[PDB]
Every structure is written in structure tokens, then in C-alpha cells.
Amino acid sequence: KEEGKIDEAADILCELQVETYGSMEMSEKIQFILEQMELSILKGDYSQATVLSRKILKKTFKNPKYESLKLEYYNLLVKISLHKREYLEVAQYLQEIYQTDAIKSDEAKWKPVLSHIVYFLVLSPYGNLQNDLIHKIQNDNNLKKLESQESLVKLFTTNELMRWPIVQKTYEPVLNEDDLAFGGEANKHHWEDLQKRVIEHNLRVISEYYSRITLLRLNELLDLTESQTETYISDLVNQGIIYAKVNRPAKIVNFEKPKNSSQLLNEWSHNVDELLEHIETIGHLITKEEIMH
Amino acid sequence: FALPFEEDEKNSDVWFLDHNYIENMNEMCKKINAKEKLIGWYHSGPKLRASDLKINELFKKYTQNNPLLLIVDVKQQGVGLPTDAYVAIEQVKDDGTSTEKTFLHLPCTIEAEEAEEIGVEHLLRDVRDQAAGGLSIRLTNQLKSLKGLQSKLKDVVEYLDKVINKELPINHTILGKLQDVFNLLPNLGTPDDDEIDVENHDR
Amino acid sequence: EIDTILSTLRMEADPSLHPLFEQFEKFYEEKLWFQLSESLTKFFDDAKSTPLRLRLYDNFVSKFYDKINQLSVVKYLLASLKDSKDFDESLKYLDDLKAQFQELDSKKQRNNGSKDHGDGILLIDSEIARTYLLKNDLVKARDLLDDLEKTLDKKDSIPLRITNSFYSTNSQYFKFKNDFNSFYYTSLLYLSTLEPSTSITLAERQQLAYDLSISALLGDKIYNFGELLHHPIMETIVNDSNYDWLFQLLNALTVGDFDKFDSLIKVQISKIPILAQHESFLRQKICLMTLIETVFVKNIRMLSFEDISKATHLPKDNVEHLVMRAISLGLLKGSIDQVNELVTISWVQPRIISGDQITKMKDRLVEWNDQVEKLGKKMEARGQSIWV
Q1: Alpha-carbon distance B184 to A268, whole Å?
Q2: Interface partners of C (3+ CB pairs, < 8 Å)?
Q3: Coil, strand, or helix at residue B103?
Q4: Which of A78, C59, C233, C368 has its CA at a distance of 20 to 30 angstroms from the CA of residue A16?
Q5: What residues have CB less than 8 Å from A138, skipping those under 6 apart?
Q6: Distance between CA A237 and CA A243 in Å, rounded?
Q7: Which residues of B touch C159 (CB under 8 A)?
Q8: Which contacts qualify for A197-202: CB closer than 8 Å, 24 or more apart?
Q9: How far is B49 from chain A (nearest CA, A)?
Q10: Residues of C with CB under 8 A from a CB of A
Q11: Are β-strands B83-93 and B68-72 bridged in parallel, bridged antiparallel, or unpaired?
Q12: Strands B97-106 and C302-304
């Protein structure tokens, strides 16, 4: 490891554990697999590390002794997912660190763990599953004893409009200056990803709110030019979040959900019923006023 | 079951009611069926009173629920229900009004058991004027239903006049209800209407 | 006896406040303790700012606690500790009385057959939370408050006094944090449930009216501007100079006149750093108020942006934001055609309905009443043969 034969050393420990499991303790088989996983990050074979993790389960961390190992495992799985750039997964491993009995009780120890969650949850694509996860976070009071994390997360739990050159500037001397969020190295190339998140969140808002809008107007909002804006709507119609139709000459982009004849009329039946309940209760309070005066 | 109650003619604030009587009545009826407990007291109407508020508070001792005041009208007025129902509830209000005891209307419905309903059907044999049966009968209901609404709306119009010139009280519950009517009002000449015509051709 | 302790307070006060103490002692001798309650009340109104109030009451707890009315004693104790500048001391007295009832109602309830000590207990708990809000341990105060709130709603019929004190603690918390919105609703309950035998002074009340007006101006979901002006508190105080201009800001929003608003703001934003750090909230509010007003009063519910642009003195870029915000906050709901250039609103939030609006509401109703009646004659006419 110290030598240049670091690369040979990874292949050695790795091959071994396929056959061997011995008459070893629980604590030792896991101890060897954690070691093996690290080596394969260093060697740069991330796929090998993926194979390695699944031999032990997460039914072998229920015991309090194995918490030091539970934590080391949950930390490792993060570095793996970070390389393949799937942030949904990263946050969920970190969520379980926070849910650790050890981590939770100590003041100092919840602070970075929670902070780290917030950054990778937002960076995940914005879908239906995203919705329920970022609002669980929002409800916690640990987060409200901080203000730095709270300002970023708050933006995507509302369904307001927001614009990239503004969001970029706000957090530039806060969290772009904290590494393992934005502005690190690999994280310098994730500051560039933050752009996509803002747009894809905006399109949710805009579809619901505008039933019809000009495209020429749309490219301002998202802070894009025409080429970018069409691509991002097309992908997003396929994903199932929104349903839309986009016109290529440079006319109008209509966001809509299909509504049949029968459906529109059903709403119109319910209006009518509800109006007649309104009028009956009104007659009762008039009768009632005669008693008052 | 009846309680002996003698109600005065000099005032409405003066009444005799036997507390000792109520328990004896309850324990005998407990023997019959033991799912019966005090849930209020009936007034024979004809109309609501504010001396009933003081009586409500007395029945609140017995109850483990909030007393139902069931104005059972004995005058059979109106073609609809002869029951309006109310429960005494406590509120503050936006006016500057403290600790108010006041009665909020409850919608009235009727249900009957299987044995009870078929008792009615044995007694009566009438076809009713509010039934929705054959072509003729529904033709009658349709005209009757419409004229029903017409009567209630006309009252509202003359009630509005009576706030604003004859100084009846202004109340946010009454105004608030009318706002809702206007906001959820249907509209024609919309694409909703064009579709209604199309549905109309199919029928 | 008590005469000797009492004498010291009599020396220090005014000569004209000297006779008042002699009457308190006159009743004590005679053993009329209803009459002593009444006599005690008087001193407290015009001199709770004295430390003589404090003294007086301490001697009274010791020699009277089942003698004068129980309720009068605990109400005094709320007043007393507002006058004590010591908090450590405050905690000590609250806990002595609280402990004293627990043993006492075992004997007390059975022997008389009645008189509940749990009414005192709530009045006591209110003052403990109040003390932690004045020491500015805000985590502690809040958590006693959630527990207390569960407890009040359990008790079936709440005396106005208890719930009044609760609502005071709730007000004090929310303007320290400067959540304008949370404060507004809680103070509407405070002004309502207000006790007839005063304990919230005129002086206190005028600063509360002010606090409310600031909250309404700088908020973002307050549009009940008129209700405050129709409430006795403000009906009566419109006659003092520092209570001209503040209200004029609130009324500028109600009628939505931007000419009046821009000029007053120039002056007062300079004066008051609260309007200045919350400037952005303040600028938004007139334009939102305007949006919701125009749809509601009109029988149409589609408006061209041109009309909206002219009213709010905005470009088309900002009508589009304003409309979007109304939808987020939930003050209007609707959809936007930027291709027809309309905003078709489809729902309006119910709000306060004033003299002018009732007339507008009323006319709409006459038209539909007459419409059914005309229509009904034809339906009488047609299908004459059968009405069976």
C-alpha cells in the first residue's frame, strides 16, 4: 500500500473473500469487506466495490456493537454513488446515519450529517418520490436550529417561481465554499448540475399555473435559449411528471392534462349540488336572526 | 319520554322542572335496552328561544356529550321537515363579543330501522307529492323543486334590506355563505356549455 | 398586627391615598371579606406601578387565602409580578400557591362541598410561561405553552379570564420573534375575550394597537385591514397624532390608491427601520390586495392584463409574477393564458364584507330571483295536461 504494489494488493484481499468466511466472528467478516471496498475506490474499480457490499446485509447491524461498522458502511456506499452521480441514493444512506441512535443524541454529531443530506437531496431529480422526502426533512426541528441549510431546502419545498442567476449568487459564499456540496472538484462539476434542478422544478409550477403560455416568454423564465428549453420539456413529458405539447415553428407551448366530455361535466354536476346545500343553511340562520332581534 | 315541566306565562325565564324524575325514567329504560343514555331534551317549539339556553346548561350535567336541543314542531309547519335541530356551543366572535352561548343549526335527516320502516309502510299506503316515481310524478317534482328554491332566495333578498335600513345584525357566517354561491356559480357560453349541448343531443 | 406593616405603606403614599388603607383594615375587623375584595381592587387600578402594591399583596396572601375570594388572590398575583423586576422571585411565589392548593382541595372540596382550585392552577401556569418569555428563554416558554394548550381545550367551559391570560403569552412570544402573521390571529382573540373589570390598561392597549397595524402592513396574508378600524380599540384611538399616519398606510392598501401609498411610505420608511428591513413585503401587499379586489367586485372573472397593468403600475413581466404569487399563497386560484392575454381566476378567497359590498352582493341576487320566477311561468304553462 505504501509501495507501488498497492494495485496488486487490492486484487489479493478481494479474490480471497470469495472462498473464505472461516470460523470468524461477525465483526471480522464485515471488518475485511469494509477494507476491501476502500481498496477498490483507491484502485479505481468502483464496480468491484458494488459487488462486494451485497455479501453482508442490513439485518446484521441491529446489534449495538456493530454500530461503528454500520456507520463505516453507510459512509462508504455514499462515495460509490457519488462517482456514478445518483444523488437520490446518497441522501438515503445519510438519512439512516441520522436515524442512528448514537448520532442523534449528541449535539455536535447531528450537525454535519443533516447538512450533508440537504445538499444531495436537492441535487437528485425532482419527481414524485422527491416530493415526500424533502418535506419529511422540512418538518424536523434539528434543521431549524440551523439557517444556512434551511434557506436552500426551503426554496424547493415551495412551488414558487425561481431563476438560476440569482440562486447561483446567494449561495456562492455560503455553500460553494463548503466542500462536499458545491465547488469541491467533482462537486465543482455538480454546481453545473444545480442549473438543471431549478429548471425542472420551474416546469412543474409553470404547467399547473399556465394552461397556455408563449415559448418566447418561456425561454426567459427558465433562463435558457430556445434549443435548451425544447429538449428539457420533451424529456420531462416522457418521465410522467407533466404532459405537454410543444410547437416547433416558435408558436406557443401548451401545458395540459386531458379532459374528456364526460369529466368536465362531472365537475359541473358537483358545483350544482353544493350550491343547493349552501342556500338551505342560509335560510336557517335567517330564521335564527328573528330570535336574536 | 316526557318529563313534567311547567312553563310560565308571565315570563319565559320562570319554569318548574323535576330533576329527581329524570333518573328514575333513565334507570327503567336502561333495563329495556342499555344503549340509551341522556343525549339532550326536546322542545316542543314552535320556535327557538334564548331561555332554552339556560335549560341546555342544566342538561349538560347529565350528559357526557354536548346537549341536543331538538325543536320538534307540533304545528307541522312547512312541506319539509318539522324538525330543526341545534346544539348549544360556545364561541368568541370577531365583533368584540366575549364568551357567547348561542345555538348552531344542525342539518336534520331521518333514518329508521328495518323493523321501524316497514311499520310505516303497513300504516300508510299513500303515494306522496314529493315522490320521484313515474313520468308524471317527476314532472310534478321538477316544477315543485324549482319553485322551492325561488321561495328561499326571495327571503334572502328582503333579509339584506332589513340589515341595512332596519338594523338587523351583521354576521360573517351569513355573508360568507352568499360569497361562495357567487364564486362557484356556473357559466355558460364556456366550452363546458358546448359540451352540455353535445351531451344533450346524445340523450 | 397588620396595622404596623400597613402603617409603613400609609406613610410613603400620598395623603389622599392614606384613607384607602384604613377602610381595608375596617373590613378586616368586622370580618366582611367580600367587602375587602372590592376595597382591594381600587388601589390596584391607579397604582400597580407602585412597590406598595407588591407589599400589600404579600401580607394579604399570608392572612387571607380562604377568607377573601380565591380567584381575586390569583388575579392579583398575575398583576404583582409584572411589577416585580425580579424573575427568580417570581418563580418562588407561583410555586408556593400552586403547592398550597394541592393539599388544600383535599380538605376543601369535601367540607364545603364545592369550590374548584384547578381554575387557580391554570392562572398560575399562564404566569410561569409568562415569566420565561420575559427571561427570554424561548425554547422553554414554547414547550410549556404547547402542554398548556392541550390542557385548556380539555376543560369544557373556559372562564374568560383564564383564556385571556393564555392569549397574552401567545402575543408576547410571536412579536419577539417577529412573525407578524402568527401574532395577527391570536390578538383578534385577545381583543375579543377582553375582561370587563380591567386588568389590561389603556396605556398597554395603545401599544398593542400599534403592534397590530405594523403586522398588517408588513405581512403577506393579512387583508382584514378594515376589521381593525371597525373594532372598538381603533374606533376610539384615531385622535392621536402617532395614530393618524399609521392607519393612513393601512387605509391606502384598502382602497388600493398607489398615489397616497407612495408618498406616505417616503416619510415613514425613514422614521421606522422595521418597514425598511421588511420593505419588499410592504411593496408587494398593495398590488396583491388590488388583484383580489378587482375580481371579487366584478361579475366578470377574466381580466385583460392591460387593465391590471394600468391599476398596479406594473409591466406585463410583473403582472405574471403577481398572479403567480397569489396562487402560491392561496389568495386566488386560477389559470393564465398569456396567449389570450387573460387571467381567468376561478376562485376567490372569502374575506370581510363591508357596507358597500353588501349592496353589490344583493343586486346579483335580485336578478337570479326574478329569473327563476319568469322562467317558472313557462314551465307552469307547458305540460298543463299533467301535474298529477
Answers
A1: 10
A2: A, B
A3: strand
A4: A78
A5: A153, A154, A157
A6: 5
A7: 99
A8: A197/A122, A197/A123, A197/A125, A197/A126, A197/A156, A198/A162, A198/A163, A198/A164, A198/A167, A199/A164, A199/A223, A199/A224, A199/A232, A200/A125, A200/A126, A200/A232, A200/A236, A201/A126, A201/A156, A201/A162, A202/A161, A202/A162
A9: 7
A10: 321, 324-325, 327-328, 335-340
A11: antiparallel
A12: unpaired
Question: b or e along B51-75 (b: 16 or more beta carbons within 10 Å of the residue's beta carbon)?
Answer: ebeebbeebbebeeeebbbbbebee
CA distance linking residue A47 with residue C78, whole number of Å = 70
| Strand C342-348, strand A244-245: pairing | unpaired
**Minimum Cα–Cα distance from B89: chain C residue:** C157
HSE toward the beta carbon, residue B111, CA cutoff 13 A: 2
CB contact under 8 A, C336 and A161: no
C339: which chain A residues are within 8 Å (Cβ-Cβ)?
212-214, 252
CA atoms of A282 and A292, how far apart (whole Å): 15
CA C118 from centroid of its chain's CA atoms: 26
Q: How far apart are CA C267 and CA C223, in angstroms?
A: 23
Omega of the bond leading into C51 within 30 degrees of 0 (cis): no
What does DSSP say about strands B97-106 and A210-214: parallel, antiparallel, or unpaired? Answer: unpaired
Number of H helices, E strands in chain B: 6, 6
Residues of chain B in contact with residue A278, where contact means CB-CB under 8 angstroms, are 177, 180-181
Distance CA(A101)–CA(A98), nearest Å, equals 8
| Residue B164 CA to its chain's centroid (Å) | 27
Which amino acid is residue A58, in one-letter code? K
Chain A to chain C, count of Cβ pairs less than 8 Å apart? 32
Strand partners, C124: none
Interface test with A, best of C142, C179, C322, C338 (most A CBs within 10 A): C338
Cell numbers for C71, please give them: 380567584
Chain C contact for A211 (CB, 8 A cutoff): yes
Experimental determination technique: cryo-EM
- Name A8's bridge partners: none
* Residue B70 backbone phi and psi in degrees, to 5: -110, 105
Query: Which of the residues A259, A261, A293 would you substitute to probe the B interface, choosing the one with the greatest number of B C-beta atoms within 10 Å?
Result: A261
Among residues C181, C174, C236, the alpha carbon closest in space to that of C209 is found at C236
Q: Chain C partners of A213 at a C-beta cutoff of 8 Å?
A: 336-339
- At B7, give phi and psi (nearest 5°): -120, 135
Cell 419545498 sits at which residue?
A157
Whether the Cβ atoms of residue C24 and residue C39 lie closer than 8 Å to each other: yes
Q: What is the C-alpha to C-alpha distance for residues A246 and A254, in angstroms, rounded to an integer? A: 7
Per-residue cell: C123: 392562572
Contact A191/A164 with Cβ under 8 angstroms? Answer: no
Q: Which of C297, C271, C281, C312 is nearest to C216 (CA)?
A: C281
The arrangement of strands across the sheet holding B97-106 comes to: B40-43, B68-72, B83-93, B97-106
Going by C-alpha positions, the residue among C83, C120, C115, C117 that lies closest to residue C103 is C117
**In this structure, are residues C332 and C292 in contact, taking their beta carbons and an 8 Å threshold?**
yes
State the resolution, in angstroms.
Answer: 4.5
